[PDB]
Design a protein around this ligand. Structure first.
Ligand SMILES: [Mg+2]
Lengths: 49, 99, 165, 1191, 543
């Protein structure tokens, strides 16, 4: 968030941090599985949290 | 002309379901079977019977007119011609009938 | 309105005439009229000119009865000595500017070409304000008026009509 | 002194400016070099179509028994005129006839007589005198292509790992490309057509360097510098010539060679065969110059020494001992003129024709045949017509105004076949280069995706024989400028030379009068002494194009605004009454003269008759010219009156000369079409005040006076051509008639018997222009139709209405109608036509006899009493006996005067030359009469020429007089574009102390951010000129200064800088601050509001998507795409988005129900399923997925 | 038929062409209100055709839709009489492509006008990015009552004062308006040559100031004293005598009362801050009325002043030649230093560039000072630049000083464009030589190409962001999390770029926050941080 907002700020444009926060939230909706256990999932699979 | 009230009410739905298609389902939805690979007659520009554009399967090309011209005008709506087997209806049906 | 014999639209040419019908129309727009007979609001003028090397606005005067051409030296077109020009013009009364679109009459004869009409008689109005001394007070104002007209209305009459409005 | 020539006060200070090279030379000179029509048969040089025929001839069969040789080519007069071709929608083309000699070299075929016959090779489109081509009735320009020059370039590239890769690319004039490139491992490879790589040691073995010893002896193997060669040897899988050649065969054809000979022959044909590989003169010259080799220019194939030298140069390039080649350098970019492209197309067509002929004579070995039976003219005609019709360089002509035309003809395009693409066009190529100085205009380039890719030639630049650009310089020795002669220097000749500006101060002897002068040295601009100069510029406007040279005070305008102004004047609509600018540059007269749109006097003479339709001039001729020419001394010129252009503008020419006026060669005879009195007049001079006006000039808006509309200052005429083709269908032949079923008599009242609207009738939207009935298949009429027929009695036949109707935005007056109809050849009609051709043949034969005896009279007058030296026919027959005195009887004994090419007539060389010229003009006149006979024969036989399947072609022309109105786009010459926001009454407009109102108001806020003070200067100088009754010429960089304008305004009684106190028209109160007032030159652009307003409630819908159509002509709605849907989603406008996506676009039932509900005032029906979703569902069901809608 | 850019999903489902739509060229309707747009008669007649048909059948003039269509096509006066009533309460939607933000589509109340161009309010131009140099806009007509209410209550231009990106006002006056407001609100002091009428007078209220101004007994820029309402140190509304300007009093006559008294020279930045504060203390309709009034006032006072662009306002310093000469002698000193081997080639190049750029900076400062002190700051060019209406310091420098150093177009793959050691000495008033013009063409073409080529990349980035963020919708009022983000003032190089209150403004507090010095409850958990809370936090030592 800080890096993107800094890049946008260098050009004199003001955008609230909440928009970048909303986007970055969607950018972090998944996890990578390290051990399937007995579950349905598979090794190194990307699944929703 | 005032558009006819198509009594096929808009199907209200909030859910979309997908799956494998059974042969029985395809036969149920199909209006007929396609035998001939011909599309249309190159001379009369009319669709060949039992072809990929046949009027007995998919519907009449002209509104309220059968393939052989025996039945014309809206007064024969819903009647399937005994000579050509084409239902007397709107041309719009050629977008929904499946073979 | 203007109707030149043998001309069906404003984008044509009269044989033997240097200027096209468009330039003739633009020159005809510049002709100025002063009323000579009272109560004359509209007049139809049939003009037939031949044997001349130049059609001037003064050549219309021999055919106009109720109006007077104020600029007879205005050249309408240059023609050959063997060119015969037969044209019909309609003179009407109006205010300000009326585009040729509004002047088109549905009952007009074939070949009639409507023209833009600039009805305004006043070319320029200039006024100045100078101080004036009355007895002991020097703050009173003096108004000076300079009016340039086309000759159809006298400047005094123009002032009187503006005051009347 | 001429009465109608505009005199301008020129502020130019530069002296000895030579004449501008003809602006249409790049087209006309190239085409004339290609065809060589004006050159006699025996004087035809080895260039153009003659070389095209030589390179493809003689054609010999596989057995070398039949030889087909080319002798000469002759061109007939065109079948139709330029105006006729435009009106009829045909191509202005000339027939080509070739004299061919066929003989058999086989002694077993001694009975085969030698045949010499003139073969008609088909119609070739011919260039107009204005430098254009008329293709399918519309003018086109073959824009010159700026492509990479033939030769070898040493370029450097970076691999993904950052390692520098050096490459040498050889592109031939005709043949395959070869590239020597290095890899990341230090092993360099040779790429053939970029398909598969081969180590160059393998190529060396294949080209004769079998052993490693020879290859190392090539480079005399400093070892670290040449380690690449050792690495390539180490990676070479071959050791002998046979192995290398077999490996090359396997790499190229992906198969094993049947034998060594074919494998060697593949390499020989690829790289050393004239038929398949051709470097050309340009490529050979460039490679010889850059490689330091002295190979003869006659060798056009690659050689071993060339390959060795290229590899050596690449090796030193890797060693940083050589520089890389700049691709954008104009030495590396070569101009392909129209003549060159025509030469290539003719070469390809003749190659195909030669292959077809070879196959035919391989088939017809034992039959007696003539060259006519061997040639199909369609092979060449189709190739040339395809090039003129489908190639990207044959573009639609920009005919908005003469400036646009002359800029289009001088345009250079980097696109097209053999050029660059928009996707592959980087920042570098689009940039301006130092070699563009005086060759490519750095100001004029289109905005958008084509910036830098489309360039305009400079005023003084020309294209040489080799195809490179030269611009004129003046030579300097010891600081002394040679002011008498100038030398054209190319980009390669300009390297290492220091160049100063044209306006540098010189003494009377030509010595530079400066201690230090700025100089151009390549890409830098160093300061040098006058001794260090090599060359000097010639004109102040040498860098600018024709457009950029028409902007006054351009040196005061920002480069971007200069670009916009240059682009914008080319969009200026021709006005009804054009007026030359008060403040101009002086190039307007030259632009009008060189445009060749205006009728130019061919020589000195006196005008006999002046009319709006024609001009007659009696040209002054000397006695020998009268003795030699067949034409009358009087020439009649037909003026172009209301001719539609490509962009819909109108060409209207009005004569400016009067009866009895004296003219000389090159004089302009007519004004009009954005010209006034021989000067280019794109717009009008207008009084302007710079102040904000109640916010109506906000954000580039323009406030204008009503006097502009009143006096037709910016009124322009546009013409629209509508064509309806009648066709023969299966159900019957379509017909044009006024009896259109289900149409009231009022709508057809203006139609003639042929269904065409009457000339001069007013066209309103929806009016019927051309009435057409299409035959209808037998269908029983509906009960409503039957009732209508019974009531009104209309005998509606079995036809359907297909009449072309006026568009909803069309309002105008018909000014021309044209109907071309194909003659129906009936037996009686064929007999009548045959009798007509017979009678025409007798009359024409009488004409040829008349022409022959006037020949006899003139020839006898020239050669009376002299002796004949023997004149030989083309067959070698000696027609006029040598030693006999010339008599009338023996001259009457010569059967054919068109074919004497040999022998001598008299001892007097002057008499012989006069007789030769007389014979040449006789040949021209006889060819003209024969072409006339052929044209009338065609007219009687077939009639009007129409495309196949079309029986009649109907055209209607409508002229639209469009006044200036709110929304119309106006612009100056300095980039100040704008939209008319309000037409203000003259009483409300600002007025001066004298009561005179200003005509236009511009926002002062637009100037400081855009840095175009040139408009300010033009305003002040134009006010000075209008008050003084003077017009001025302002050359760029050598124009009017501030002190001169101040002096002129002081003389004219104008406040300095135009700073005067204005008065409000509404309240009469003087404004608090003085305003800049004066006269500015304004143009009216083609972005007019009448063509851009569109509105639709309902209309036609598309076929598959059922969406409403797009475009104004189809009466369609606007596109409502993804970003705007995102905007609706952001607003939370659910219902608006739903309504738009379904009931306004593709809900077939929903849209009709919504319209009915709106009309009847009921509640809006619920949206249904869009047809796009129905199509998606149907596709997914057809693909075998069961999809159900669940509630 | 399904995948790819040309498949059904991306081609026929995400975009469509619509009925009840229109398009034409846009012209400025400065006499209109913020929520009004001028609509040409033909466009309105075609768009509102079925409504006009309905009213025709209701009036009994025509019994069939065909006769109604015939009447409408003939453009009879009754059609206009009906259309005038039909336009009322039925807004249209104005869209200019590209629609980069939601303000690219706005709802306006249509008005019938003459001509064929759509009239746009000047304040919507910034949101639409629309100028009047040939731009066109699409017109979309909502049909159903839900759509009409949606437009009126969410997409109306008067309701869209704020920028959704940051909350700052986007309907700020510009160009003519800003210049006029600046001209009216600027002060002029009396001089013996140009005495100012009415300076030093005292007035009981704005009423007497208006009386004096209308009587021409006081100047617009005169420094006066007036008695009116203004906030005291406690935040209450009291009367006091405040030194002000007649133009400022006239400007405050339309300012909403609750905003106090505005006593500063008006520029674009101050105007934006003022509109923000007024909307903070009042409601949206009052701010819209204020915007309309100040727009009219700025336009009128810019028109009355006759503010122009003349060659006399571009005052090239008389010392320009002298400092160019001094720079030339310094460059000569550097060159002879290099020739004797005292400095390197790179050092000489850097020193020459430094000398030229110092000369350019000094000349820019001197030119700005001259133009500023000209006519007591009432020079039209200086008024245009200082107010923020148009123009920058660099552009005024190029018109008056020297265009300066230029970058070479060289194709150096390693380094960037080198700077030519000889700058463009001439300016646009003096005129550029052939060489200088050829040099500047490089930069002009480079800029045009860069813009034209990178617009599409920006659009692609926008598309990817929309694709990744489309599913975020506020669905629940509170999820009850105890987790939050710790926000502090943004400092860069010892400079506070964003204040703590500005960053936390509009957020919801995690826990209760107490003043460390007074133990007062500043913030409550689960409550929005308003502007007053922002001031309280800034007063307290909270970081
Ligand atoms: Mg724009």
């Amino acid at each position: 968030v800080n890096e993107v907002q800094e890049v946008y700020r260098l050009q004199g444009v003001k955008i609230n941090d909440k928009h970048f926060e909303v986007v970055v939230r969607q950018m972090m909706r998944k996890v990578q599985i390290q051990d399937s256990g007995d579950t349905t999932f598979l090794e190194n699979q990307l699944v929703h949290k | 002309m005032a558009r006819i009230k198509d009594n096929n009410a808009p199907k209200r739905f909030n859910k979309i379901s997908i799956g494998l298609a059974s042969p029985e389902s395809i036969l149920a939805e199909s209006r007929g079977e396609v035998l001939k690979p011909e599309t249309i007659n190159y001379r009369t520009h009319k669709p060949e019977r039992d072809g990929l554009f046949c009027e007995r399967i998919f519907g009449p090309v002209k509104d309220y007119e059968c393939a052989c011209g025996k039945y014309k005008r809206i007064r024969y709506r819903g009647i399937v011609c005994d000579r050509c087997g084409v239902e007397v209806t709107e041309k719009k049906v050629r977008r929904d009938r499946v073979g | 309105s203007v109707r030149i014999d043998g001309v069906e639209h404003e984008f044509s040419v009269v044989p033997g005439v240097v200027e096209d019908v468009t330039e003739i129309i633009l020159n005809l727009k510049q002709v100025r009229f002063k009323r000579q007979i009272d109560d004359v609001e509209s007049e139809t003028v049939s003009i037939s000119v031949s044997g001349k090397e130049q059609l001037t606005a003064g050549d219309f005067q021999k055919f106009i009865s109720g109006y007077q051409v104020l600029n007879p030296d205005l050249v309408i077109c240059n023609m050959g000595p063997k060119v015969s020009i037969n044209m019909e013009i309609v003179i009407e009364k109006g205010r300000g500017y009326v585009p040729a679109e509004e002047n088109k009459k549905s009952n007009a004869p074939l070949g009639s070409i409507a023209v833009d009409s600039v009805y305004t008689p006043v070319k320029n109005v200039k006024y100045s304000i100078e101080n004036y001394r009355v007895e002991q007070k020097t703050d009173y104002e003096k108004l000076v008026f300079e009016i340039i007209t086309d000759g159809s209305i006298h400047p005094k009459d123009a002032l009187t009509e503006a005051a009347k409005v | 002194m001429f009465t109608n020539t505009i005199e301008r006060v020129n502020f130019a200070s530069a002296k000895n400016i030579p004449e501008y090279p003809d602006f249409l030379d790049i087209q006309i000179k190239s085409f004339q070099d290609f065809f060589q029509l004006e050159t006699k048969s025996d004087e035809r040089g080895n260039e153009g179509l003659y070389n095209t025929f030589m390179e493809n001839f003689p054609i010999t069969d596989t057995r070398n028994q039949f030889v087909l040789e080319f002798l000469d080519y002759f061109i007939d007069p065109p079948r139709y005129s330029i105006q006729e071709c435009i009106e009829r929608g045909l191509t202005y083309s000339v027939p080509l006839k070739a004299r061919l000699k066929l003989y058999c070299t086989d002694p077993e075929h001694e009975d085969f007589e030698t045949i010499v016959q003139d073969v008609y090779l088909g119609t070739i489109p011919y260039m107009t005198p204005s430098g254009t081509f008329v293709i399918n009735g519309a003018e086109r320009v073959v824009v010159s292509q700026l492509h990479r020059s033939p030769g070898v370039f040493f370029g450097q590239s970076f691999h993904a790992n950052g390692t520098k890769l050096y490459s040498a690319r050889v592109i031939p004039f005709k043949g395959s490309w070869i590239e020597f490139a290095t890899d990341i491992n230090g092993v360099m490879y040779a790429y053939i057509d970029r398909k598969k790589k081969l180590p160059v040691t393998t190529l060396f073995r294949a080209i004769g360097f079998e052993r490693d010893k020879d290859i190392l002896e090539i480079f005399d193997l400093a070892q670290s510098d040449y380690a690449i060669i050792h690495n390539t040897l180490q990676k070479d899988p071959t050791n002998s010539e046979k192995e290398a050649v077999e490996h090359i065969y396997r790499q190229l054809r992906n198969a094993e060679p049947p034998d060594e000979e074919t494998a060697r022959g593949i390499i020989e044909k690829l790289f050393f065969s004239d038929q398949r590989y051709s470097l050309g003169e340009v490529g050979r010259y460039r490679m010889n110059k850059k490689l330091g080799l002295d190979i003869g220019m006659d060798k056009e194939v690659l050689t071993k020494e060339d390959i060795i030298t290229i590899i050596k140069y690449l090796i030193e390039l890797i060693n940083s001992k050589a520089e890389i080649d700049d691709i954008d350098h104009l030495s590396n970019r070569r101009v392909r003129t129209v003549g060159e492209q025509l030469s290539q197309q003719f070469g390809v067509g003749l190659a195909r024709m030669a292959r077809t002929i070879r196959e035919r004579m391989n088939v017809r070995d034992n039959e007696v045949f003539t060259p006519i039976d061997l040639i199909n003219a369609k092979t060449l005609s189709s190739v040339i017509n395809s090039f003129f019709g489908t190639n990207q360089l044959s573009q639609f002509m920009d005919q908005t105004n003469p400036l646009a035309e002359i800029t289009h003809k001088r345009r250079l395009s980097a696109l097209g076949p053999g050029g660059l693409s928009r996707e592959r066009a980087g920042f570098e190529v689009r940039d301006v280069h130092y070699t563009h100085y005086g060759r490519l205009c750095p100001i004029e380039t289109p905005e958008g995706p084509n910036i830098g890719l489309i360039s305009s030639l400079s005023v003084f630049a020309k294209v040489n024989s080799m195809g490179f650009l030269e611009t004129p310089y003046r030579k300097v020795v010891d600081g002394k400028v040679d002011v008498k002669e100038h030398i054209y220097l190319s980009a390669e000749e300009e390297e290492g030379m220091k160049i100063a500006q044209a306006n540098i101060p010189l003494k009377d002897d030509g010595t530079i009068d400066r201690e230090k002068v700025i100089a151009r040295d390549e890409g830098d601009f160093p300061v040098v002494d006058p001794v260090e100069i090599n060359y000097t510029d010639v004109a102040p406007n040498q860098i600018a194009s024709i457009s950029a040279s028409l902007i006054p005070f351009l040196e005061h305008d920002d480069a971007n605004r200069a670009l916009m102004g240059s682009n914008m004047m080319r969009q200026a609509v021709p006005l009804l009454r054009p007026e030359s600018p008060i403040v101009g540059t002086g190039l307007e007269r030259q632009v009008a003269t060189d445009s060749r749109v205006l009728i130019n006097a061919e020589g000195d003479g006196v005008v006999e008759y002046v009319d709006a339709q024609k001009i007659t001039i009696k040209y002054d001729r000397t006695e020998e010219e009268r003795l030699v020419s067949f034409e009358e001394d009087s020439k009649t010129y037909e003026l172009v009156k209301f001719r539609k252009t490509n962009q819909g503008t109108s060409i209207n020419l009005k004569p400016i000369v009067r009866k009895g006026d004296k003219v000389k060669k090159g004089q302009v005879l007519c004004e009009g079409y954005a010209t006034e009195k021989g000067e280019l007049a794109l717009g009008r001079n207008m009084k302007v005040a710079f102040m904000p006006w109640k916010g109506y000039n906000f954000e580039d808006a323009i406030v204008i006076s009503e006097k502009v509309v009143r006096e037709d200052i910016f009124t322009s005429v546009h013409i629209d051509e509508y064509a309806l083709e009648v066709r023969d269908t299966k159900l019957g032949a379509e017909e044009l008639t006024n009896d259109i079923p289900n149409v009231s008599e009022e709508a057809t009242r203006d139609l003639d018997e042929y269904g065409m609207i009457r000339i001069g009738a007013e066209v309103k939207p929806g009016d019927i222009l051309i009435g057409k009935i299409t035959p209808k298949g037998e269908s029983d009429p509906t009960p409503e139709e039957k009732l209508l027929r019974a009531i009104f009695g209309d005998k509606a036949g079995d036809v359907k209405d297909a009449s072309l109707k006026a568009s909803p935005s069309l309002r105008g007056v018909v000014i021309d109608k044209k109907l071309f109809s194909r003659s129906i050849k009936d037996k009686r009609k064929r007999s009548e036509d045959k009798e007509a051709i017979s009678r025409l043949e007798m009359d024409y034969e009488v004409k040829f006899q008349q022409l022959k005896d006037v020949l006899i009279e003139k020839l006898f007058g020239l050669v009376n009493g002299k002796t004949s030296q023997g004149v030989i026919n083309d067959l070698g027959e000696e027609v006029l006996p040598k030693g006999k005195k010339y008599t009338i009887k023996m001259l009457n004994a010569v059967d054919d005067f068109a074919h004497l090419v040999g022998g001598s007539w008299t001892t007097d060389e002057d008499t012989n030359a006069l007789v030769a010229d007389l014979l040449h003009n006789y040949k021209i006149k006889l060819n003209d009469i024969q072409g006339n006979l052929r044209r009338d024969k065609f007219t009687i036989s077939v009639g009007d020429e129409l495309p196949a399947g079309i029986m009649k072609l109907a055209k209607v022309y409508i002229a639209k007089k469009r006044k200036l109105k709110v929304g119309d786009k106006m612009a100056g010459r300095h980039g100040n574009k704008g939209i008319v926001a309000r037409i203000v009454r003259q009483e409300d407009m600002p007025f001066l102390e004298d009561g005179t109102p200003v005509d236009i108001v511009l926002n002062p806020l637009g100037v400081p951010s855009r840095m175009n003070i040139g408009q300010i200067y033009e305003t002040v100088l134009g006010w000075a000129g209008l008050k003084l009754g003077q017009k001025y010429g302002t050359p760029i960089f050598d124009g009017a200064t501030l002190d001169d304008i101040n002096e002129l305004t002081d003389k004219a009684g104008v406040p300095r800088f135009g700073h005067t106190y204005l008065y409000d028209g509404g309240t009469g109160q003087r404004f608090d601050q003085a305003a800049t007032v004066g006269v500015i030159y304004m143009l009216k652009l083609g972005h007019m509001v009448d063509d851009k307003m569109h509105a639709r409630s309902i209309g036609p819908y598309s076929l598959i998507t059922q969406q409403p159509l797009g475009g104004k002509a189809q009466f369609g709605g606007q596109r409502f795409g993804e970003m705007e849907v995102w905007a609706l989603e952001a607003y939370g406008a659910s219902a608006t988005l739903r309504e738009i996506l379904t009931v306004k676009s593709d809900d077939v039932i929903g849209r009709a129900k919504t319209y009915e509900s709106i009309v009847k005032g009921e509640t809006m029906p619920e949206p249904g399923l869009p047809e796009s979703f129905n199509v998606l569902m149907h596709e997914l069901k057809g693909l075998g997925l069961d999809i159900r809608l669940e509630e | 038929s399904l995948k790819g850019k040309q498949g059904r999903f991306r081609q026929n489902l995400l975009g469509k062409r619509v009925d009840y739509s229109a398009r034409s060229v846009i012209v400025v309707g400065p006499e209109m209100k913020l929520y009004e747009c001028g609509l040409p008669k033909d466009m309105a007649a075609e768009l509102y055709k079925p409504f006009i048909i309905r009213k025709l059948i209701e009036r009994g003039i025509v019994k069939t839709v065909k006769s109604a269509k015939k009447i409408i096509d003939k453009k009879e006066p009754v059609v206009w009489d009906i259309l005038e009533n039909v336009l009322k309460g039925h807004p249209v939607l104005l869209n200019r492509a590209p629609t980069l933000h939601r303000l690219g589509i706005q709802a306006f109340q249509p008005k019938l006008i003459e001509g064929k161009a759509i009239r746009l309010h000047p304040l919507a131009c910034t949101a639409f990015n629309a100028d009047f140099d040939g731009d066109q806009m699409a017109v979309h007509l909502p049909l159903g009552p839900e759509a009409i209410l949606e437009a009126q209550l969410l997409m109306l231009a008067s309701q869209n004062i704020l920028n959704p990106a940051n909350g700052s006002p986007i309907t700020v006056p510009s160009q003519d308006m800003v210049l006029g407001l600046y001209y009216m609100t600027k002060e002029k002091r009396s001089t013996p040559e140009e005495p100012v009428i009415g300076e030093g007078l005292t007035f009981y209220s704005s009423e007497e100031v208006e009386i004096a101004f209308n009587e021409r007994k006081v100047a617009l820029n005169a420094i006066i004293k007036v008695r009116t309402k203004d906030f005291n140190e406690a935040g209450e509304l009291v009367n006091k005598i405040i030194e002000t300007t007649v133009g400022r009093v006239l400007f405050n006559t339309v300012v909403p009362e609750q905003a106090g008294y505005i006593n500063t020279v008006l520029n674009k930045k101050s105007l934006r801050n003022i509109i923000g504060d007024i909307l903070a203390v009042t409601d949206v309709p009052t701010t819209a009325d204020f915007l309309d009034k100040i727009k009219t006032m700025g336009y009128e006072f810019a028109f009355k002043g006759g503010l122009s662009f003349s060659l006399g306002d571009i005052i090239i310093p008389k010392e320009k030649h002298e400092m160019i000469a001094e720079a030339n002698e310094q460059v000569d000193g550097i060159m002879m230093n290099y020739n004797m081997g005292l400095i390197t080639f790179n050092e000489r190049y850097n020193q020459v560039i430094d000398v030229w750029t110092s000369t350019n900076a000094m000349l820019t400062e001197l030119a700005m000072k001259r133009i500023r002190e000209d006519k007591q700051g009432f020079n039209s060019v200086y008024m245009m630049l200082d107010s923020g209406a148009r123009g920058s310091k660099e552009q005024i420098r190029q018109l008056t000083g020297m265009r300066g150093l230029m970058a070479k177009p060289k194709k150096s793959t390693a380094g960037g464009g080198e700077i030519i050691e000889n700058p463009i000495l001439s300016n646009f008033k003096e005129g550029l030589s052939i060489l200088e013009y050829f040099i500047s063409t490089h930069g002009a073409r480079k800029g045009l190409a860069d813009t034209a080529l990178k617009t599409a990349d920006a659009g692609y980035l926008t598309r990817r962001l929309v694709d990744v963020s489309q599913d975020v919708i506020i669905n629940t009022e509170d999820c009850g999390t105890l987790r939050g983000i710790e926000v502090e003032a943004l400092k860069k190089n010892e400079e506070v770029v964003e204040t703590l209150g500005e960053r936390i403004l509009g957020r919801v507090s995690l826990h209760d926050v107490y003043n460390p010095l007074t133990e007062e409850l500043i913030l409550k958990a689960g409550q929005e941080i308003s502007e007053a809370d922002v001031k309280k936090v800034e007063a307290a030592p909270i970081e």
